[PDB]
Amino acid sequence: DWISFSHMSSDTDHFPIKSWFRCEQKAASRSYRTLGDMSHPQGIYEVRAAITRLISLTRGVKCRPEQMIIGAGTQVLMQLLTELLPKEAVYAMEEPGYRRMYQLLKNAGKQVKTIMLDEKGMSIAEITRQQPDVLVTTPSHQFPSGTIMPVSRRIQLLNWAAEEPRRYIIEDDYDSEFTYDVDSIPALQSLDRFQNVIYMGTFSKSLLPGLRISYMVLPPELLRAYKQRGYDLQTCSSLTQLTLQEFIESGEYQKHIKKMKQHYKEKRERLITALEAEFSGEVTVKGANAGLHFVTEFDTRRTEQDILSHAAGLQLEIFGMSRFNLKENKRQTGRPALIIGFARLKEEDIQEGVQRLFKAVYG
Amino acid sequence: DWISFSHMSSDTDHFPIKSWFRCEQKAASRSYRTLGDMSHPQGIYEVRAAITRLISLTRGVKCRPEQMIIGAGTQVLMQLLTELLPKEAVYAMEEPGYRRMYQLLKNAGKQVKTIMLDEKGMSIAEITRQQPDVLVTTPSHQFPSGTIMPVSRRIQLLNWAAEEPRRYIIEDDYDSEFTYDVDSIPALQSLDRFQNVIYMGTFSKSLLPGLRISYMVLPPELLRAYKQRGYDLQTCSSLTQLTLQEFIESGEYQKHIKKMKQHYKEKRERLITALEAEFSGEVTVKGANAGLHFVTEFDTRRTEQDILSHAAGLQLEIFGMSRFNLKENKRQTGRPALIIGFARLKEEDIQEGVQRLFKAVYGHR
Ligand SMILES: Cc1ncc(COP(=O)(O)O)c(CNCCCC(=O)O)c1O
């Protein structure tokens, strides 16, 4: 009975789960003799090669498959990365941003500066002033604000990293697969002429988060630091990797993304239109030109926690922007701001969801 | 025409891949609408409940699913543990042992003591001497010497840990689904009255056709430490989790374990008979009646490296004890003690494998 405006979930109904299992039988019969065993620690080479081709095609990312590392989550690869990067590196994160990564870095004993955003995303002025060593950025659709970083700002960050040795940018290209605006913008890593960027990718938005498949691409110098480790074991089963590779090479991935691009586009249009009507125009929407969510701000007498406590009662799954407040202070000011995810939201349940949303906002 | 005496986990020839895939289907059907969600960070709860019920009756492990953390393999679970334990904790490991885990700890910048064995396992003598803060131990079937630590030694370790704060015992239970003849002695943590043991288990032996599924059971203090972080995400795919749960609860698992046990019971018997037949009083089989490996000591004038070198020339794959040293600096190998691993040993390969081993142990015949 719940309706879900979650940005963390997907509808199982639009994922071709039967194709996936069919690829799995194919991968299994292809590599039956050795499915049993562990893969190369970075992941199967042929599989790393398929991905390499994919992200070069879609994101213009330039690399050799040996630079790629596959892992069971962005957060296992982020941890590893903190061990490849200089021990005394000062990290910098978007504010607001991904609270888990913030917590991960702190718990690793790192200093994390918090960089505020402007209309173009991560503030280059703040970056220069604070002087961190490594930036963590989400250029395709800033998490959670949704700002698509323009190539002008991408170049600004790439010039910053070039100006001094041992500066790195971690490019978190999370939900970069769908675009409802001018066409794609090549990843920072592709615009880079000096190998200062670590490109991170995941299959959680395109596939299903249940499937724990992610990867990252290392500059050569960090790759040699990884290989010098010797003890690392792969975290994705051999069959999972081969199933993904089969899913992609068969073209099913390409079909799935193209179908979904259209599906999300139209569902996003519907949902917004229904927000503007039900709220009479008295709602502010931001970060809606890409990705699987946007941000909505309301004029109401209620606090964010009131709306959230109430929306929970109306059986509406929804999250407050306060969830993404990195630098702490008792400072909720202005309009309550909520993130509106729509991957998990049914076509049929848009009108009801907006009405439930209205009631939770106003009473 | 290679023959391998080097495997300690099965392969796809041994695994009912079809049963697994069919359980995966059913699990997926049952839990369709929830695949679009990411798991609970400790793993799906009802999965944790299933494993817990299982391990309580097979190993005598006493715990609640609330204390269990599921992960994509033992490495990732060990990595996390080092972050839950005191930063400046000193670790200690058995020698001979799992070198990979030695490097993991060393790369994490930890002090690691190396602790020799006697005929009851990890040396309490050496432990009370070298004074570490946390022990890493394989009490059910030592890796790779095969020693089953007796309860008297388990109690000594337990008492040791209880004596000062910030002392813990990691218990690596890795192949305890296979016990031959006499029933097993339960897991060490079944004796753990003061919450000093962290139980680490895996499905790598009893199953692994590549599956990355392990789990660890935490004492409340470390569990609270874990819940304090708030940033951890499950690494084991939700599909793998539900499948295994179905595999277990459908009964398919015990049926598999029952079959494999007899199969490995046969092979160990048939292999030891053959060793005793071609060698006689010249072979000593040291090791327990458990697991997928044992230790052979040879009464020969060849050195370990000689035998290993003649072994590769006869296309027989084996390892001597010296491989399982954790550390090395200015010394080398030893004298005829090899470990035999028979998880992937064809029955047809037994006599020929034993005949090559005989050749390599003298260089004649
Ligand atoms: C900022 C950011 N980057 C990457 C990911 C993908 O993570 P996995 O590869 O799936 O482990 C995510 C995923 N996050 C959803 C959680 C959002 C929340 O509100 O907690 C992410 O956010």
Ligand SMILES: *Cc1c(COP(=O)(O)O)cnc(C)c1O
């Ligand atoms: C196989 C094994 C493990 C478990 O490793 P996984 O990460 O579960 O594959 C742990 N300890 C020892 C000694 C082993 O041989």
